[PDB]
Design a protein around this ligand. Sequence first.
Ligand SMILES: CC1=N[C@H](C(=O)O)CCN1
Ligand SMILES: CC1=N[C@H](C(=O)O)CCN1
Lengths: 327, 327
Amino acid sequence: MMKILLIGMGGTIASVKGENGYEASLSVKEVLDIAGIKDCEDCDFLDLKNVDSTLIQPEDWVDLAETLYKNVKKYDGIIVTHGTDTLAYTSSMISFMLRNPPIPIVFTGSMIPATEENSDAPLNLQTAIKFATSGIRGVYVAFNGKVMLGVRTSKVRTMSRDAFESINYPIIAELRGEDLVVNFIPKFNNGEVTLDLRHDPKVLVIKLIPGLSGDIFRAAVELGYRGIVIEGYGAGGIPYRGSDLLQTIEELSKEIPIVMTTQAMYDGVDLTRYKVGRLALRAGVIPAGDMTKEATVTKLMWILGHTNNVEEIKVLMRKNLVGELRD
Amino acid sequence: MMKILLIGMGGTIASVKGENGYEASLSVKEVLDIAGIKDCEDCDFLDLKNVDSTLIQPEDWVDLAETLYKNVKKYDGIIVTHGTDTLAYTSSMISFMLRNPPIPIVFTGSMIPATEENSDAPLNLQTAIKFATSGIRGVYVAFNGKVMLGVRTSKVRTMSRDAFESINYPIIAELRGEDLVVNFIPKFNNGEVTLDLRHDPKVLVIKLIPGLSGDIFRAAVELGYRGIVIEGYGAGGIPYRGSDLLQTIEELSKEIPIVMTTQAMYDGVDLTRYKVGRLALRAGVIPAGDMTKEATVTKLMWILGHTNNVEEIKVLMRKNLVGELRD
Ligand SMILES: CC1=N[C@H](C(=O)O)CCN1
Ligand SMILES: CC1=N[C@H](C(=O)O)CCN1
């Protein structure tokens, strides 16, 4: 029957409490054994990386995307074990780099090392295995009995089992007993499996705070940053009182994309709603709509691997590519 | 009986849909009338500002703190109506600037203008009035039937009534019918009412993302920024692979405070837990513990109004001043 591949990237799930605190150490095969999984007769194992996900770089996304693409024909499902810190960035970026996969690609990990007795690893691996053999294609994240679309997933808690949520977007599937029950299936168009590794990682994310001036923005441009994301307040906007920020934005927004997302967790941005928003639009700011913060950052990096034309970048950022955005 | 003062700062609650979308317009007295409030016989009214809270600057915090201090003896309670965008920054900063107030000081506002038929304004004003006459002293936020400690409050939703949550800290009070029921009373020491307006607003908040280099940090220092806050991933830490960031931090952390908070919403940071965290500590990074992002930023600004000595700043950031932090 079904053949699945497990790819190890590291993470708390594979970690041990060494000298300087937890660090990734175990292989993905060892992780499965320790977590007590046996329903894996026809399971292949590959260790791609073995790091605390805080260490993940954009080139690791390239390496992982390539590896996935080389293996989508050979397997019925692929599971990637990964640290939780940057799990959502990786699942978001891979969603852009590897479009219309013919199989489920499921990211998972744990908040508590698999070695530990109270570990969330066995549940998460079980959920991942159940989904990887479901026939439901796409890039997903399995965590705490939930399956979420990889490009709509964010880490919301640092010290809880329920660490990940689907942001502004319905759960794909959820455990009821041992029944993984479907809640919502994304509406894919199924084109040709497409690998597209092009990206530019040189982007800056600045949190809007009272009194912020435009000086660090023009410094970023001088440093050769190719894009800036600003987390505004609430539905989004730029203050015009108190700083040269709006004036600074008006000048820079035609040299580089300036993307507005929100500091809040849920509901995203809508710049048409307030005067501060519409001024931000007039200044050339690109809205990130209802995208997660991780999808916004990775999508911008990915697009910058294709074009530096701000107008075109605006069009692509506003276009729903893989389910990351409400069109 | 009880005498309360209402101070208007603006916000959606006082807003109208003008030419470029919503902008603040109505006076705080008009807001009360439109919201349908009458149980306010002995209520004084003062309009301090009238702006979309996206426009709030640090000097407005000074003006508001001064006004509160001049009025804490005259009234039994004070209510401040305020935009939701920066409400939490203002309630956090005022908590540092105005210590041991002898009365309840309650911040509130609404997600939907008081003019609108389905407005959350009447409920929020009611809750604010009930708490302002409760005799429970301190700085608080009332929203969606909840009363939260002002220095533990963040905006988590941009388009929902339940916009604010108490982060890593128990609700103070909650509505059950018309009964405002107490859940938890903060353990104040009641010293002398202290006004302390000293702050330095020149701080930068950068979101950690894969591949981030230290170049923008040393640019910030050259720009004269007096502090940097970094939102790390999860429990916190600095990547040592892929960038000159950790090396950059080691150099800068003795010139200016570099504070680590988290990109996630709940549970805060703990740098002792992972190798990436302990390296961050060794590099001179100051942990923000379980503080909200708004408390972290305002507390740092406030402290920078007192000292530029990094060692001392570290001590103060790690000290629970007004309930913002678990000691
Ligand atoms: C490299 C690549 N070539 C084929 C294509 O683009 O159609 C498969 C997916 N991507
Ligand atoms: C300015 C001021 N003086 C008095 C004091 O510090 O004790 C009251 C609170 N702050």
